[PDB]
Amino acid sequence: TSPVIGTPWKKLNAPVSEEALEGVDKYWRVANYLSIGQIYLRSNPLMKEPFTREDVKHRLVGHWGTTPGLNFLIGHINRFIADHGQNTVIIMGPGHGGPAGTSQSYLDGTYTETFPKITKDEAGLQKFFRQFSYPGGIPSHFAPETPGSIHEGGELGYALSHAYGAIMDNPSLFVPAIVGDGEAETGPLATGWQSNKLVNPRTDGIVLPILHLNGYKIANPTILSRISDEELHEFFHGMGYEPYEFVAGFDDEDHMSIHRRFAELWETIWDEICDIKATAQTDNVHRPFYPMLIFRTPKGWTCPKYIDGKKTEGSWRSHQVPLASARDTEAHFEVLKNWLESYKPEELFDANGAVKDDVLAFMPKGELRIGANPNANGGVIRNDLKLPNLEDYEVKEVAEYGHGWGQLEATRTLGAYTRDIIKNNPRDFRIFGPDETASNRLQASYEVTNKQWDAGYISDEVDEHMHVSGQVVEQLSEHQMEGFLEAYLLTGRHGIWSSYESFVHVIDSMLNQHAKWLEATVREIPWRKPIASMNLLVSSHVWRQDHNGFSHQDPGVTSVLLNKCFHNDHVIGIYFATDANMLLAIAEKCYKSTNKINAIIAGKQPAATWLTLDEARAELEKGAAAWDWASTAKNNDEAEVVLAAAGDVPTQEIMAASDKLKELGVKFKVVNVADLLSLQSAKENDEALTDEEFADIFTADKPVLFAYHSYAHDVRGLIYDRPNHDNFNVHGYEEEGSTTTPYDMVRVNRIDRYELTAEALRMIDADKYADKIDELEKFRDEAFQFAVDNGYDHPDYTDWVYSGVNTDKKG
Amino acid sequence: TSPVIGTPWKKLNAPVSEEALEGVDKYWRVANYLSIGQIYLRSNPLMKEPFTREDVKHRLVGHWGTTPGLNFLIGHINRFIADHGQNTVIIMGPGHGGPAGTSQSYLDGTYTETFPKITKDEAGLQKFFRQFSYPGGIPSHFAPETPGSIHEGGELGYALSHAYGAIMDNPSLFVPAIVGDGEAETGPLATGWQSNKLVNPRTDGIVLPILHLNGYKIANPTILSRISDEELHEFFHGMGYEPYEFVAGFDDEDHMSIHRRFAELWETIWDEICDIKATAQTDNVHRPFYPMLIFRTPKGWTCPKYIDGKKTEGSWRSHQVPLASARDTEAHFEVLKNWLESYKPEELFDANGAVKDDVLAFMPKGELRIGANPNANGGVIRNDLKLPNLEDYEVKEVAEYGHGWGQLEATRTLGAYTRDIIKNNPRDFRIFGPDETASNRLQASYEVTNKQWDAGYISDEVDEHMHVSGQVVEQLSEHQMEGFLEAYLLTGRHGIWSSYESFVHVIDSMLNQHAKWLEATVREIPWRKPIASMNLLVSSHVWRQDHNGFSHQDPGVTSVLLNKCFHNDHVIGIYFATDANMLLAIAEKCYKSTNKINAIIAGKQPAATWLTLDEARAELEKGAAAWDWASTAKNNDEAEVVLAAAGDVPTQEIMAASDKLKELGVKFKVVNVADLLSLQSAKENDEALTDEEFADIFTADKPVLFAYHSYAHDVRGLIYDRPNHDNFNVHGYEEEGSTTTPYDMVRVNRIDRYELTAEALRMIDADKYADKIDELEKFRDEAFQFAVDNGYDHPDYTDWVYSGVNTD
Numbered sequence A: 001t002s003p004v005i006g007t008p009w010k011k012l013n014a015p016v017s018e019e020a021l022e023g024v025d026k027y028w029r030v031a032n033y034l035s036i037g038q039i040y041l042r043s044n045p046l047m048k049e050p051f052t053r054e055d056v057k058h059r060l061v062g063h064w065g066t067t068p069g070l071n072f073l074i075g076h077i078n079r080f081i082a083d084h085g086q087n088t089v090i091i092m093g094p095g096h097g098g099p100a101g102t103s104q105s106y107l108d109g110t111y112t113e114t115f116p117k118i119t120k121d122e123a124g125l126q127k128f129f130r131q132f133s134y135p136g137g138i139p140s141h142f143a144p145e146t147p148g149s150i151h152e153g154g155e156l157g158y159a160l161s162h163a164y165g166a167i168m169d170n171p172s173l174f175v176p177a178i179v180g181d182g183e184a185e186t187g188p189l190a191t192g193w194q195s196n197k198l199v200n201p202r203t204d205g206i207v208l209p210i211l212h213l214n215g216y217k218i219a220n221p222t223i224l225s226r227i228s229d230e231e232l233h234e235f236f237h238g239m240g241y242e243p244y245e246f247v248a249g250f251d252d253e254d255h256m257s258i259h260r261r262f263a264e265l266w267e268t269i270w271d272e273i274c275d276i277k278a279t280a281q282t283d284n285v286h287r288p289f290y291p292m293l294i295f296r297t298p299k300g301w302t303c304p305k306y307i308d309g310k311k312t313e314g315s316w317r318s319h320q321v322p323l324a325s326a327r328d329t330e331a332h333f334e335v336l337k338n339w340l341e342s343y344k345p346e347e348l349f350d351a352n353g354a355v356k357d358d359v360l361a362f363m364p365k366g367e368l369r370i371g372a373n374p375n376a377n378g379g380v381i382r383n384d385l386k387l388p389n390l391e392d393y394e395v396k397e398v399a400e401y402g403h404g405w406g407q408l409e410a411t412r413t414l415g416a417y418t419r420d421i422i423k424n425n426p427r428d429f430r431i432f433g434p435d436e437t438a439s440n441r442l443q444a445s446y447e448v449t450n451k452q453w454d455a456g457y458i459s460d461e462v463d464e465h466m467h468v469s470g471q472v473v474e475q476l477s478e479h480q481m482e483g484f485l486e487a488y489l490l491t492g493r494h495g496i497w498s499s500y501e502s503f504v505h506v507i508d509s510m511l512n513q514h515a516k517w518l519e520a521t522v523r524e525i526p527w528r529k530p531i532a533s534m535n536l537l538v539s540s541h542v543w544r545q546d547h548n549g550f551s552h553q554d555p556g557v558t559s560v561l562l563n564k565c566f567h568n569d570h571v572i573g574i575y576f577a578t579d580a581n582m583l584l585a586i587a588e589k590c591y592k593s594t595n596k597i598n599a600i601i602a603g604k605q606p607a608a609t610w611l612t613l614d615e616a617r618a619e620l621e622k623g624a625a626a627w628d629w630a631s632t633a634k635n636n637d638e639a640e641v642v643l644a645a646a647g648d649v650p651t652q653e654i655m656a657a658s659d660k661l662k663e664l665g666v667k668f669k670v671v672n673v674a675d676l677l678s679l680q681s682a683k684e685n686d687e688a689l690t691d692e693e694f695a696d697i698f699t700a701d702k703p704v705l706f707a708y709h710s711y712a713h714d715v716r717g718l719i720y721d722r723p724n725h726d727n728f729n730v731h732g733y734e735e736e737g738s739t740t741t742p743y744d745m746v747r748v749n750r751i752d753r754y755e756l757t758a759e760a761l762r763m764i765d766a767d768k769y770a771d772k773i774d775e776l777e778k779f780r781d782e783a784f785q786f787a788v789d790n791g792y793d794h795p796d797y798t799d800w801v802y803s804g805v806n807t808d809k810k811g
Numbered sequence B: 001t002s003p004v005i006g007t008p009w010k011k012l013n014a015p016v017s018e019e020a021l022e023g024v025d026k027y028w029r030v031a032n033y034l035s036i037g038q039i040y041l042r043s044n045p046l047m048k049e050p051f052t053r054e055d056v057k058h059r060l061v062g063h064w065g066t067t068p069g070l071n072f073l074i075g076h077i078n079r080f081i082a083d084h085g086q087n088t089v090i091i092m093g094p095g096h097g098g099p100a101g102t103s104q105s106y107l108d109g110t111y112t113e114t115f116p117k118i119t120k121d122e123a124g125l126q127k128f129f130r131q132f133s134y135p136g137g138i139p140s141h142f143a144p145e146t147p148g149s150i151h152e153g154g155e156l157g158y159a160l161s162h163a164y165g166a167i168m169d170n171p172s173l174f175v176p177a178i179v180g181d182g183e184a185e186t187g188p189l190a191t192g193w194q195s196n197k198l199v200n201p202r203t204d205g206i207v208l209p210i211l212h213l214n215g216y217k218i219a220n221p222t223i224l225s226r227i228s229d230e231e232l233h234e235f236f237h238g239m240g241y242e243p244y245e246f247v248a249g250f251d252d253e254d255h256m257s258i259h260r261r262f263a264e265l266w267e268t269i270w271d272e273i274c275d276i277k278a279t280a281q282t283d284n285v286h287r288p289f290y291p292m293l294i295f296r297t298p299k300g301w302t303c304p305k306y307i308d309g310k311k312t313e314g315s316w317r318s319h320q321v322p323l324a325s326a327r328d329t330e331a332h333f334e335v336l337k338n339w340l341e342s343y344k345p346e347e348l349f350d351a352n353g354a355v356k357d358d359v360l361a362f363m364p365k366g367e368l369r370i371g372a373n374p375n376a377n378g379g380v381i382r383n384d385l386k387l388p389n390l391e392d393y394e395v396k397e398v399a400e401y402g403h404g405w406g407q408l409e410a411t412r413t414l415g416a417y418t419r420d421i422i423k424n425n426p427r428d429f430r431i432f433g434p435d436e437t438a439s440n441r442l443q444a445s446y447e448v449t450n451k452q453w454d455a456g457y458i459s460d461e462v463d464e465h466m467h468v469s470g471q472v473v474e475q476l477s478e479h480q481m482e483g484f485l486e487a488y489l490l491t492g493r494h495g496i497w498s499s500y501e502s503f504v505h506v507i508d509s510m511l512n513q514h515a516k517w518l519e520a521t522v523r524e525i526p527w528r529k530p531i532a533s534m535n536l537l538v539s540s541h542v543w544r545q546d547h548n549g550f551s552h553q554d555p556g557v558t559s560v561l562l563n564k565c566f567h568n569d570h571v572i573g574i575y576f577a578t579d580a581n582m583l584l585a586i587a588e589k590c591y592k593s594t595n596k597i598n599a600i601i602a603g604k605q606p607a608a609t610w611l612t613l614d615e616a617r618a619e620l621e622k623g624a625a626a627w628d629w630a631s632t633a634k635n636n637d638e639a640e641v642v643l644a645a646a647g648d649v650p651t652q653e654i655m656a657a658s659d660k661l662k663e664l665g666v667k668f669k670v671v672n673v674a675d676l677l678s679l680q681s682a683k684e685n686d687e688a689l690t691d692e693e694f695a696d697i698f699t700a701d702k703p704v705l706f707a708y709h710s711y712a713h714d715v716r717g718l719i720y721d722r723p724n725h726d727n728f729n730v731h732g733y734e735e736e737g738s739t740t741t742p743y744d745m746v747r748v749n750r751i752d753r754y755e756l757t758a759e760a761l762r763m764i765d766a767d768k769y770a771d772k773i774d775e776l777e778k779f780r781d782e783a784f785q786f787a788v789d790n791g792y793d794h795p796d797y798t799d800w801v802y803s804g805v806n807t808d
C-alpha cells in the first residue's frame, strides 16, 4: 500500500515568513537562470570574461515560454512542502518545460545524488547547461531520466488522468497538477476535469488542478484565455471545482508583492483543502467543491518584452526561444547577456559556482523533496501481490471429460482469480473499465468491492455495486481508464483494465507513450525501480462482434504493439488466451511481471477448453507447443500438413478442421501459439523460440496452415527469417463481416473450419482431393443460406464437439 | 460550394397546430413499433392471428434503451422541418440507436426509394423487421447503408466534431447534434463543446447540441445526470451555450401534454437561433451564446416499467433489450405482445399494412426530408476543384543544376499550391491543424485567407492572420481536426489537415472508423456518391524529431493504415514525398481522388530535390521507379546490390551511400518508392506492380538494401510472396533516438549513409571489403563523438551534396 509521508493536511496557522518569500524570489531567479542556461550555453555557465558567442550552443533546442511560469509555481510549492511537511508529487502537463524540472532537481540535491558527475560548482553547472537536449546528454522534456517525474508531458492530454490515478488509495498524497491552456483544448484533458466525481476525499488523496493560463499555445491564443472570465469561472464551478484566479506580470508590480499575494492565496486554497480532508474523516458521502487555480501570467514572463520590434513577453513568440539566435549577430548576443544579467546571478552563486545557502534555506529536505519522494519512483514502494493458488481456479472438467470440453466464458475465470487478488491485496489492486467491466465478464470483483462513485445516488433498484469507495472505477473514456491505471502503477500499485478490442485503438498513442517511458527506463535508468505491468484484457474480439457489426471489428492493437518489440527491452507481451486455463497461465505471468504492457486477447463468448492448467503453463513458457493428443502424425516426417492457431476462435475453427481431416485419414500436426512474440526473429528477440525449436514445432519443409486472430501481415512480417517461412499459409481478419452469425464472421474472412479443411487439402494435393474440396465449398454457401433462412447457424457448426471428448459420460 | 435549400432561419409567428402535434405522437408510436419490430420479429409484423413465439427472432440483436428518446426527438424535428422549410441534417451520437434511423427513412419514403424490395405493405414490413442485424440484412447502427446518416456513432465521441464540420461554409444548414450522456464522458466529446468559438454565425450554419440525458450508459449512471442541475447549467453556460432543459416521462403526464411542452420549448429555442442568424447579417464579430437542449427522459421510455421484478424503464437494464428472450417462455412472449399492443398498431396501419396517411401528413417532402437532403449524401453536392497548373510550383532548379540540388523545405511547396487552391475554390476547401499549420510550413495560406477565430481579440501585436471568418481552423486537438474535416468531406467539400507524425496516433481509431465507412460504401452502397478524400499531411517526422525527443518519434501510422488494404477497396493511400516535386505529384493525385484516406509523409526539414515534376509524376503512376541517372549498373544482370528507399531521409542516406559505393566502383541499381501499396502482393492488390514489374525493378536474384521510413515489419509483411523477397535487407525506425542531431537519429537506427554502405559491402562480400566495412564502422563512432564535442554534426555528413549536382 502507499506509505504515509510527513504530516499531511496541516494548516500553517501563521502568515508565510518574509524570509521564506525572499527564498522563493531567489529560487525563481536562479531557476530561470539555469533554464536559459540549459537552452543557450555550451560553456561558461557564470559568464566570466571573456563571455562570447562561442559560449552559446550552435542549435537552440528547448522551450522558454512555459518555463518561467513553471519555475514560479515550483518555487512556491517547494516553500509550501517545507513549511507544512506535505507529501507532494507534481504533474507538469507542459512537459516541454523540462528545464524547470531539471532545475528543481539540481536545486533540491537529487540531481547530484543521482548523477554524481553533475556537481554543485562551476564545472558541474557547465556540464549541466551543456547536456540539456544535447547529443549524449538528456531530453528536452520532463523525461523519466529526471528525478521527480512520473509524467513527461510530451504528448499532451494526460495531465489530469495521471494526477487523479496517483492519489487513488493514496490519502496522504497531494498533487498540484499543472495543465497547459493549450493542453486544455485536447479531448483527454477536457474529460479528465470530471475525475473529481470518481475519487473520495477520505480513501483517496487530493489533486489541485492549476491552469497555466499564459494566453497562448505554439502559434495561437488559447480558447480558455480569450473567453470572458465569468464563462471561465462558471465552466470550472460546473465541473465541481471552486475556482481561484491569480493574475500577475501584466504591469509593474514588484516581484516581492507578487510573491506575497501568491503565498497568501495558496495558503487560503490549502486551508480549504485541509477543511475538506478534516470533514472527510466524519462525512465522505457528500462531494465537496475542490479548489482549482487559474494562474494567469504572460507567456515567457521576464524575457525581453520586445525583440527586433516583435512582442515576445505575453506572446506565442516566446514559446520555443524568444531570441532565435545569440550567435548570428552581436546585438542578439547583447540581448541574451542582458537577459541572463537581469536575474542578478552575482547574488545567487558563490565563487565556486555553487548556489548560495540563503537561496535554498527554505527548500524541503529528505524524502519530502520533489526529486526524492518515493511516489515519483513507485518501484521503491511496490511489493509483489499475494496471489491465490492458480490451481484453485483451473477448469478441471478437461482432465476428466477430455480436451475440447464445455461451453465456458473464459474471462469469468480471470474474473474469479482477480476477485481473490483484490481480497488478499486491498488498497494495492484496481480494475478500470470504460462501462464494460460486466460486459467483459469481470463482475465477480463486485463480490468483495464496489464501483467507486462520488456523484449522486437515487435508488437501490439501479445503484447496484457502487460505493463512494471501491477498487473498480468506470467512466466511458478509454483515455481516463488507461490514464488512471498508468499513474496507479507509477506510484507503486497494481491492476488491470478491459476494453472491447476495436476501441483499444482509442488509446493507441497512450500505449505508445507508456511503452517509450518503459523502453528508456529499462535501457538507461537503473535508479528507477521496476513498476507493475499495465495489464489490458482485450475481449469482445472481432470474431464475436457479429452482434454490433463492422464498426467493432478491428483486432489490430496487435500490429501497434509489435512496433515496440525491439532491442530486447521486453516491455511488450502479446498473449492469446486459447481457453480459460491458458488465461490463468497468462494472468499469473502478467500479475508477477514488471516493466511491461501485457495485452491479453481473450474471448468472453462460450468456448471449448483445450488445455489443462499444467499443459497451458508448459505451452506458455515456450510460447507455442505442438498438441501430440490432437496430431495424427507421430513425428514431423509423417505429417502432410501442420495446422497452427493463435486465438480462441482460430483454435476452435482449426480443431474442427482437424476432425474433418482425421475422418479423411490425413496425417496432420496441431500447433497452438499463446505468445505472439515467441515467433519473432531469434536474431531480434533472445526470448523467442530458436530456429532449432521453430523448425521442430512447425517442421522445416511441410506446408503450414496458420489461422491467426488478427491481420496476417502481423505473422508474415514476424517470421520473415524463420525456417519454412515460405510454406506458411496465414489466414486472419481481412476487413469483412457485418451484423451476422458467428459462422458468417469466420466464413467471410476465409477462416471457417470448412475453408481451413479445404485449404489443407489444396496444400497437400488439389487434384487428389478436388472432389472433397468442392463438397466443402458448396457446404459453406449452404451453411450461410441456412443462417439467412433460419436466423442461427447450421447444426454441423453449432452442435460440433471435438472427437476427443468422452460425451458417452453424461457430464 | 454548399447549396441553399428551403427557407432558412424562419420563425413560425404562430403556435404549433394541435394537428401537427397529433401527427408527432403517431410518428413516435409507429416509429417505436417499427423499432421493437426490427429487434424482436422474423415474421408477422402486424401480429395477425396466429401470433406465436415462432414469429420472434432466435437471437435478439439491437438496442432499445436510447431508441424511444431518439424516435421522440426525430418526430419533433420532422414536424419542425416541414413547418419551417429548414435545411436539416441530424447527428445521431448514440449510433447503437440504428432502429430510429431505419424507421425514420421507412416513414419518410427514402427507404423504399433506395431499397425497392422494401415495400410500404405487410410483405415489405416483414422484410424490414427481419433484415435488421440479421445475416444477409442491414447493420445494428446508423450505418452508411441508411439514408440520412453521415455519422454511424459506432465508436462514440465524434458527434460534436462532425456536427460543427458539417455547418462550416454551410450558412443555410441546421444540425441538431444528439449527444449520448455516456458519450459526453469520452474525451473527444468533452472538447467538441468548445467548437462554438471556431464558427461564425454569418458564414457558417448552426449546431443545436442535444444532450440525451437518459441517466445511464450500459451498466452505470452517467456523471452528467447525477451532478446538481445548477452545476450542469453553469457547465454549459461557461462553454458559451444558453442551456434549456426539458424533463418528461418520470410521472403520469399524458403524451399530448409532453408534445405541447416540447414543441413550445423547441420553437422558443428556434426563435433565439433565428435572432442569432438575423443579428449575424449586421454584427458577426460578437460571439452569441448558442442554445443547447438538455433532454432528460427515462432510458427505454415506454418499455414495461418492471420485468421479472427488475426496474427496466429508467434503468441501464433497458440498454440492449429490456426483455432478454421472447421465446424462452409464454410469460415473456406475453410481455412482448402487451408491449407492442401498448402502441395501438391498429390505428397506425391500414389492411395492406401501409402506414396511414394521417400518421405522415405532418412530414417534410422532397429534399427537406432527413433521408434525401443532399448534405447527408454529400457526393451529389461535390464538384471537382479548380486546380492551378502543377507546373507553376515545380522546383525547376533540379532541371538546371541537377538531381540533389538545394536545401528546400518541401512542405512550403504544398503550402503555395494549397494557398492557390483556396484562392480559386473559395468556401470549398479548408486547412485544419492542431496548432501546427505554421510549424508544418503551410502558412502561405495566410496570403489569401485567415485562421477562423470567434473568441476574444486583444492586440495586433499578437492576433496575426485571424478573422471571425476564414478557411484555416486550429485547436490543439487531433480529434477536433480529424472530426471537422471528415464532416466537411461528407457534406461535399474538400480539404487537408497536417499533424506531427507521432501524434497522428491520437486519432488512429478515427481513421479506422472513416476507413470502414468508405470500405462499406465502395463495396455495397452505389447510391452514396463518392466524397472528396481525407488528405492528411504527416510531417515533422521521426528522423527530424531530434529537437523534441523520443516522445515525438513514432511513424507507425503506416502499420495502422496497412490494416485497411483488402478486397481491392482502394480506400487508403500511403505516399512518401521523396522531395517537393514528388509532393506536388502526390498532392494533385490526392486532390483529384475520392473515397480515400491519403497519408502523405513529407519532411519540412531542409532537404535535396531529386526528381523533376515529370519524373515524379511518372514514378508515382507505377508507385516505384529505377533511377537510371543514379544507377552504375546499366542492367540487372550487371548489378551487384540494389539500393531502395521510401522517404525523404532514407532517400538522402541511400543516395549518399550510392556516392560512397561509386568511389569503390560497385555496380548498383537505385530504386525510389513513393507509393507503399505498389509493393503489396499482386494477388491481393490489382493496382500493385505485377511480379513482372517487381522483378524488373528490384531484380529476380540480387541483394536488395531497402531503407524504409517507418518500421521494417511494414515492408517485410507486404512482400511475403514477391520474387526475390528473401534477399530484402530492410532497415527502418527501431525505437532508438533521443534529443540529439540529425546524424545521430539515423546512426542509432542503423540507416545512416555509412552503415548503409557497410551493409551493401557486407551483402556483396564481407571478406573482400572487410577492411572498408571496418573503416565505415569507426567513422560512425568518430562522427557521433564529433557531435558530442562540437554540438553540431561532422561536415562529411553536414556538407555532402550528390556528385550529380554542379556545385561550381
Ligand SMILES: Cc1ncc(C[n+]2csc(CCOP(=O)(O)OP(=O)(O)O)c2C)c(N)n1
Binding pocket: A065, A066, A094, A096, A154, A155, A156, A157, A179, A180, A181, A182, A183, A184, A186, A212, A214, A216, A217, A218, A222, A299, A319, B434, B435, B436, B476, B500, B503, B506
Ligand atoms: C497531442 C499533442 N498534439 C500536439 C503537440 C505539439 N505541441 C507541443 S507544445 C504545444 C502547445 C501547448 O501549449 P500549452 O498547452 O499552452 O503550453 P505552454 O504555452 O505552457 O507551453 C503543441 C501543440 C503535442 N505535444 N501533443
Ligand SMILES: Cc1ncc(C[n+]2csc(CCOP(=O)(O)OP(=O)(O)O)c2C)c(N)n1
Binding pocket: A434, A435, A436, A476, A478, A503, A506, B065, B066, B094, B096, B154, B155, B156, B157, B179, B180, B181, B182, B183, B184, B186, B212, B214, B216, B217, B218, B222, B299, B319
Ligand atoms: C469509444 C467507445 N467506447 C465504448 C463503447 C461501448 N459502448 C457502446 S454504447 C455505450 C454506452 C453509451 O451510453 P450513452 O452514450 O449514454 O447512450 P444511450 O444511453 O443513449 O444508449 C458504450 C460504453 C463504444 N461504443 N465506443
Ligand SMILES: [Ca+2]
Binding pocket: A180, A181, A182, A212, A213, A214, A215, A216, A217, A222
Ligand atoms: Ca499555454
Ligand SMILES: [Ca+2]
Binding pocket: B180, B181, B182, B212, B213, B214, B215, B216, B217, B222
Ligand atoms: Ca445514456
